[PDB]
From Swiss-Prot, chain A:
Its job: Required for dimerization of active 70S ribosomes into 100S ribosomes in stationary phase; 100S ribosomes are translationally inactive and sometimes present during exponential growth.
Subunit structure: Interacts with 100S ribosomes.
Domain of life: Bacteria
Protein location: Cytoplasm
Species of provenance: Staphylococcus aureus (strain bovine RF122 / ET3-1)
Stated name of the protein: Ribosome hibernation promotion factor
Organism lineage string: Bacteria, Bacillati, Bacillota, Bacilli, Bacillales
Family named by the database record: Belongs to the HPF/YfiA ribosome-associated protein family. Long HPF subfamily.
Gene from which this protein is expressed: hpf
UniProtKB/Swiss-Prot annotation, chain B:
Gene Ontology CC annotation, any one: ribosome
Lineage start: Bacteria, Bacillati, Bacillota, Bacilli, Bacillales
Family under the similarity heading: Belongs to the universal ribosomal protein uS8 family.
Keyword hit for Ribosomal protein: yes
SUPFAM superfamilies associated with the record: Ribosomal protein S8 (SSF56047)
Record keywords: Ribonucleoprotein, Ribosomal protein, RNA-binding, rRNA-binding
Coiled-coil blocks: none
BP GO annotations: translation
Subunit field text: Part of the 30S ribosomal subunit. Contacts proteins S5 and S12.
Record-given protein name: Small ribosomal subunit protein uS8
Swiss-Prot record, chain C:
One annotated Gene Ontology cellular component of this protein: small ribosomal subunit
Lineage summary: Bacteria, Bacillati, Bacillota, Bacilli, Bacillales
Protein name: Small ribosomal subunit protein uS5
Keyword annotations of the record: Ribonucleoprotein, Ribosomal protein, RNA-binding, rRNA-binding
This protein's record includes keyword rRNA-binding: yes
Gene3D superfamilies, alphabetized: 3.30.160.20, 3.30.230.10
Family: Belongs to the universal ribosomal protein uS5 family.
Swiss-Prot record, chain F:
Keyword annotations of the record: Ribonucleoprotein, Ribosomal protein, RNA-binding, rRNA-binding
Name of the coding gene: rpsO
Gene Ontology molecular functions: rRNA binding; structural constituent of ribosome
Cellular component annotations (GO), alphabetically ordered: cytosolic small ribosomal subunit
Cited InterPro entries: Ribosomal_uS15, Ribosomal_uS15_bac-type, uS15_NS1_RNA-bd_sf
Protein's GO biological process: translation
Stored CDD domains: Ribosomal_S15p_S13e (cd00353)
Keyword check for rRNA-binding: yes
Subunit record text: Part of the 30S ribosomal subunit. Forms a bridge to the 50S subunit in the 70S ribosome, contacting the 23S rRNA.
Protein's name in the database: Small ribosomal subunit protein uS15
SUPFAM superfamilies: S15/NS1 RNA-binding domain (SSF47060)
Function, in words: One of the primary rRNA binding proteins, it binds directly to 16S rRNA where it helps nucleate assembly of the platform of the 30S subunit by binding and bridging several RNA helices of the 16S rRNA. Forms an intersubunit bridge (bridge B4) with the 23S rRNA of the 50S subunit in the ribosome.
PROSITE patterns reported in the protein's UniProt record: RIBOSOMAL_S15
Keyword Metal-binding part of the UniProt annotation: no
Length: 57, 131, 156, 226, 54, 88, 52
RNA sequence: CGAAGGCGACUUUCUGGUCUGUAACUGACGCUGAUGUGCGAAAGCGUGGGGAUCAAACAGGAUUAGAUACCCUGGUAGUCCACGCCGUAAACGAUGAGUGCUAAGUGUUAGGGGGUUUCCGCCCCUUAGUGCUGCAGCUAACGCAUUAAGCACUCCGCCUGG
């Protein structure tokens, strides 16, 4: 079978700039956070472009 | 079925002093009220408060602390106790901590401090040591 | 300037597969006969260098000993683990009476007249620290009235 | 004027704390409330602390002292180097070397080395060396300025210290209290304020919560000079 | 509510594929539901509404 | 033990005034019902030892209320011994 | 007790090898190979639960 | 769950205790408890039953350098029930009972609520239990830490070199 290793993270409120900083400090391509001003769950990601994209869930 | 009330008072005060608490409350009495009234006159606590409730009205103590985060009451000891009551004449009525600390003593005038019992020339049951 | 005084030197060997070890340690008491005393230990092999290792180690921890003159302010018992000294004030013409290790930590501050007795255990490491911990918890008459809020004459 | 205004102080996000179930009970004074697992650092009271943090650090540099800046949390490493250069003080980016305030009679032995090893190859005595001994003399050279890079020009003890986290940098704070050096630091939830004398309650896992708060304390010494 | 021991269909989703009892670790019920269940699953074993083994 | 209609019956005679359950002689009488009920159970079940210290405890809580009742009025204690049969 | 047909025998075994491992037969008779003491199985079950 | 020993199919009868909530009622009626009086695992003992497995003693076969051990086959008392005894265990949380007081975090139990609901799901605050972490304080050190081995008061048992 295929085993998907889970990496647990606890969701936290921050700026998008902060999420970029923390994501780079781990080199992770995905960082999910709750937006500081919008209150919604946001996923900053690195595209295949190499540019950043922002998803709101 | 706690068996010594004003020793339970006196270790509530010690345990609040250890964790730097500034506010606790007691199930009170007359002798609990008037021991707590005599610590603010000597200057160990800040201010005692009212007695209000329907049954055995509580009172609050307001401990007092040094300006460099030190504590005023450093050590607090009940001396007379059930099973062995200690009584002192006014002649050998002892000075606490070379006259520094006090010794509140139940005499036949109401309870009084260590200083106020020799010049009054009365003795009685010596309740506790406060230092 | 500081006044050096030893307590004891010890001859300690730790067992090795080959030749065993030659560590000579020593504790000293450092004071100034005015109200400031510290202790410390020092581990070396050169014995006069093992002394001065302990002297400079005492220099980092000096405790201020409060004093009504010629004696100690009040009656205390020190505690550190098992060692426990007793400390009664005396008249100014009695002479300081004390045991082996506790005399050196009592002469190096200026008292020279107190009653004392080392209760409890016996090892010189603990009773010199159970005396400093006693002398740590002494209080003058003037600074208690600062905390208590009265004056020096109102306390009496 | 005097303090940080209320708008840009919470725009950095310093009101966030760490998680509930991850709480220190001594920080009850500096917490306004918890909002969805997260606590709310009392914002009015930390303004009443950062001005007190501004008051002494003004007059520390008035005496001409040297304030040490340390930062080792990975999202706040290079936010303290750029503020120490603007301040002209001494920084720490990498880990605490383990004695650079206490066993610094053997650390200044190697600050003497970094004043010497770069002199050793700007002049001669470099062509005669074996080409792999050139490597380890340079492999020593960068690893000195990795850890002791901000202690490059520092030759004496400091007179104040500024920490970003007492949790991860607990080796530094334990050396501070033995030397009686006064201490100021950013604390939050999961931090003990007892060992810090001059307390700044602010967030710690955000960059603007560091950078818009560590810059004014770096700025606090510049107008204490003149 | 209370499990009646005649209501077989809700009671036999809790029996195993041989006749054993599923633990509440794998089913997911609460504590007092599981032991109010087990005094009803075993009165239904006695009156042959459910087997002991299949 | 005993049923509530048995228990509410026995608190009618020894009641001192209406809605005064918990009075000493109204909670000694309900003990003497519970004493006599359980040692009749225990008579035919001689091996039941865990129910015996339930008996021996409520023997003790009846004795501590009889000793209490003499200390404030003796004439009420004499009436309860005659009303329901106890020795001593 | 499961019937497997319309296939080979090397695939009915793959059903049957996991229709026995999800049953109290092999782990049950290995337990009752020898009498254990009535207070050492309470610790044997405790070790088989604290590890989970 | 029970005071401990302990207690595991299911049903009925008989019966003991605890917890929660309400506040109607009694008005210190409480706590501890020498002597005393009762419970108290197993192995035992008595009088009878019953005897399936297991199994001291015992018999035989192997191993080993050697056996009366370990291993294997077989096997009696016992294991089981009823009634009387015996009253001892590393009967151990190696920690007497009672009542207060003193950072927190986290599982779980019967709840109580709850907010919600769920297709019952849950996730939320709540007495009293039961665990795991961990300050102050304590300890000779390990460690203990609102289930103290912290701070107190009462009473009982007990120790003072091997």
């Amino acid at each position: 079978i295929e085993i998907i290793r889970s990496k647990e993270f606890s969701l936290k409120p921050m700026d998008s700039e902060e999420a970029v900083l923390q994501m780079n400090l781990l080199g992770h391509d995905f960082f999910v956070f709750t937006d500081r001003e919008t209150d919604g769950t946001s996923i900053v990601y690195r595209r295949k472009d190499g540019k950043y994209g922002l998803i709101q869930t | 079925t706690m068996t010594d009330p004003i020793a339970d008072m006196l270790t509530r005060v010690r345990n609040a002093n250890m964790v730097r608490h500034e506010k606790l409350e007691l199930p009170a009495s007359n002798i609990k009220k008037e021991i707590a009234e005599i610590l603010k006159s000597e200057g160990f606590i800040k201010n005692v408060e009212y007695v209000e409730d329907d049954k055995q009205g509580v009172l609050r103590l307001f401990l007092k602390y040094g300006q460099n985060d030190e504590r005023v009451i450093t050590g607090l000891k009940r001396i007379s106790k059930p099973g062995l009551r200690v009584y002192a004449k006014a002649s050998e009525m002892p000075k606490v901590l070379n006259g520094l600390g006090i010794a509140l003593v139940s005499t036949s005038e109401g309870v009084i401090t260590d200083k106020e019992a020799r010049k009054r020339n009365v003795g009685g049951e010596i309740i506790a040591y406060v230092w | 300037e500081f006044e050096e005084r030893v307590v004891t030197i010890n001859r300690v060997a730790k067992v090795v597969k080959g030749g065993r070890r030659f560590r000579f340690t020593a504790l000293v008491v450092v004071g100034d006969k005015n109200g400031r005393v510290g202790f410390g230990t020092g581990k070396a092999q050169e014995v006069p260098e093992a002394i001065k290792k302990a002297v400079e180690a005492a220099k980092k921890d000096l405790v201020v000993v409060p004093r009504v003159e010629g004696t100690t302010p009040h009656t205390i018992t020190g505690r550190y683990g098992s060692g426990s000294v007793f400390m009664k004030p005396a008249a100014p013409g009695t002479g300081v009476i004390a045991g082996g290790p506790v005399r050196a930590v009592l002469e190096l501050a200026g008292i020279t007249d107190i009653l004392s007795k080392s209760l409890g255990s016996n090892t010189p490491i603990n009773m010199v620290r159970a005396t400093i911990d006693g002398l740590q918890n002494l209080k003058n008459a003037e600074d208690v009235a600062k905390l208590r809020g009265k004056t020096v004459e109102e306390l009496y | 004027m005097a303090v940080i205004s209320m708008k840009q102080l919470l725009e950095a996000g310093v009101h966030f704390g760490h998680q509930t179930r991850r709480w220190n009970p001594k920080m009850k004074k500096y917490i306004f409330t918890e909002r969805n697992g997260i606590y709310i650092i009392d914002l009015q009271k930390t303004v009443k602390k950062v001005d007190e943090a501004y008051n002494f650090l003004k007059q520390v540099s008035e005496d001409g002292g040297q304030v040490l800046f340390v930062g080792t949390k990975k999202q706040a490493q290079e936010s303290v180097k750029s503020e120490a250069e603007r301040a002209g003080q001494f920084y720490i980016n990498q880990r605490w070397l383990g004695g650079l305030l206490t066993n610094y009679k053997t650390i200044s032995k190697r600050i003497k080395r970094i004043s010497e090893i770069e002199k050793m190859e700007e002049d001669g005595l470099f062509e005669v060396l074996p080409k792999k001994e050139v490597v380890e003399l340079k492999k020593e050279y960068d690893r000195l300025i990795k850890f002791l890079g901000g202690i490059r020009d520092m030759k004496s003890m400091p007179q104040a210290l500024f920490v970003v986290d007492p949790r991860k940098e607990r080796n530094a704070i334990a050396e501070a209290r033995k030397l009686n050096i006064p201490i100021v630091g950013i604390v939050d939830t999961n931090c003990d304020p007892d060992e810090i004398d001059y307390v700044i309650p602010a967030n710690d896992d955000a960059i603007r919560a560091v950078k818009l708060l560590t810059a004014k304390m770096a700025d606090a010494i510049l107008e204490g000079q003149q | 509510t209370h499990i009646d021991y005649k209501d077989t269909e809700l009671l036999k989703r809790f029996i195993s594929e041989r006749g054993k009892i599923l633990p509440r670790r794998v089913t997911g019920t609460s504590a007092k539901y599981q032991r109010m269940l087990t005094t009803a699953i075993k009165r239904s074993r006695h009156m042959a509404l459910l087997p002991y083994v299949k | 033990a005993i049923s509530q209609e048995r228990k509410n019956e026995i608190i009618k005679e020894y009641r001192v005034h209406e809605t005064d359950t918990g009075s000493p002689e109204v909670q000694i009488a309900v003990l003497t019902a519970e004493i006599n009920a359980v040692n009749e159970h225990l008579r035919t079940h001689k091996k039941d030892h865990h129910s015996r210290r339930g008996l021996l405890k409520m023997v003790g809580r009846r004795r501590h209320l009889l000793n209490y009742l003499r200390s404030k009025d003796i004439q009420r204690y004499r009436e309860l011994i005659k009303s329901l049969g106890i020795r001593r | 007790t499961v019937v497997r047909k319309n296939e080979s025998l090397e695939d009915a075994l793959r059903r049957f090898k996991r229709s026995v491992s999800k049953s109290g037969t092999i782990q049950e008779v290995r337990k009752r190979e020898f009498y254990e003491k009535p207070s050492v199985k309470r610790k044997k079950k405790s070790e088989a639960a604290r590890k989970r």
